[PDB]
């Protein structure tokens, strides 16, 4: 019983603002070029969560869309990649839980252009970099104790949300 | 549920 959030962020140059896909997995799909412009669900057992969840999550990943725009602009500098256009980000954070629903292990490995990037370990306190630019991300994600906060999310709305998800089976 | 802690690169 996992909880994965594959956050596909394609810059889609030319036409304008980046075209964002937020397919998550246990589910949901935030196509930023769809018609709803709200967090349209793609799972049966998520409808049972009401306006205390739909609006909250919708605004949360509306914020996450701008966060991914900013981080994509950041990797324009980090890798110093070609500014010719499209460059896809693949976020893959999440956490596993035992059948008991407690935090088994967490995993936040980043993937820019298919390959590897900063990756979280089994200890959930220290990441594991992948190249020269990843160490810059290490610096800021270990300085602000972002490891602790992503831990308590993975020991948190990851664990608690997956608890509610397992409870969704009545 | 899509952590409201979206940490930046």
């Amino acid at each position, epitope marked *: 019983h996992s909880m994965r959030y594959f956050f596909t962020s394609v810059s889609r140059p030319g036409r304008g603002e980046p075209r964002f896909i937020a397919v998550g997995y246990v589910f949901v799909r935030f196509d930023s070029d769809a018609a709803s412009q709200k967090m349209e669900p793609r799972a049966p057992w998520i409808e049972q969560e009401g306006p205390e969840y739909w609006d909250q999550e919708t605004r949360n990943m509306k914020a996450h869309s701008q966060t991914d725009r900013a981080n994509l602009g950041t990797l324009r500098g980090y890798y110093n990649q070609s500014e010719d256009g499209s460059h896809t980000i693949q976020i893959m954070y999440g956490c596993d839980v035992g059948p008991d629903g407690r935090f088994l292990r967490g995993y936040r490995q980043d993937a820019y252009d298919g390959k590897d990037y900063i990756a979280l370990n089994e200890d959930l306190r220290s990441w594991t970099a992948a190249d020269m630019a990843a160490q810059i991300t290490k610096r800021k994600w270990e300085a602000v104790h972002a490891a602790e*906060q992503r831990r308590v999310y993975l020991e*948190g709305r990851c664990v608690d949300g997956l608890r509610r998800y397992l409870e969704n089976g009545k | 549920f899509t952590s409201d802690y*979206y940490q930046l690169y």
Partner: T-cell receptor
Amino acid sequence: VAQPEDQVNVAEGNPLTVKCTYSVSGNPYLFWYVQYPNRGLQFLLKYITGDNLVKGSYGFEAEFNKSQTSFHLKKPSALVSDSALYFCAVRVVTSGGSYIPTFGRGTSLIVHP
Amino acid sequence: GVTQTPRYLIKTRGQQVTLSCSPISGHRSVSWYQQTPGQGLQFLFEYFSETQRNKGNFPGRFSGRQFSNSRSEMNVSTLELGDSALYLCASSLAGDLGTEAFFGQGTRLTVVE
């Protein structure tokens, strides 16, 4: 956070004893906020992980103690400028991962000269 | 710092007010605080890039909203006597546990009957 002493009386050069007690159902992510007069709250020091004996701005320090469940802001040398309302803020991290800062009722450290 | 307008304001009962907060350059998270002499510093509500992430314990007549450029505004419509306090705004990077929290100088309001 429950700051017990509303008015702490410390002479110039005595161990500051700004008592902070926290009651949380989770790990202590503690923070000290000094509210200088005619200004807003400024950051003093934090304990997230690592050494129990922490240090912060303006020479302040704290001793996170599990033996007392307390986070006393201690300062061996007292200055008159220390006369401010000190807030002990525990950031109860929401399940999502956003910090909701819950402060104490305010300790009026007068630092009597 | 977090520049705040209006700095100080007076209104009557039932009148509408609007307070403005602009975070630090590059900061995209904004919190709102209210400082009552009696109850201390209370959390109002926190915004993060057009998204209210957290909210405190205040009546339904306390509302706020943040635009695309991280600028946030707070407005109060039906003014009761308990609305006399200092209203603080905060900033952050993304709601990091160790990103500190730059607070503003606040706006103090009092409601004359």
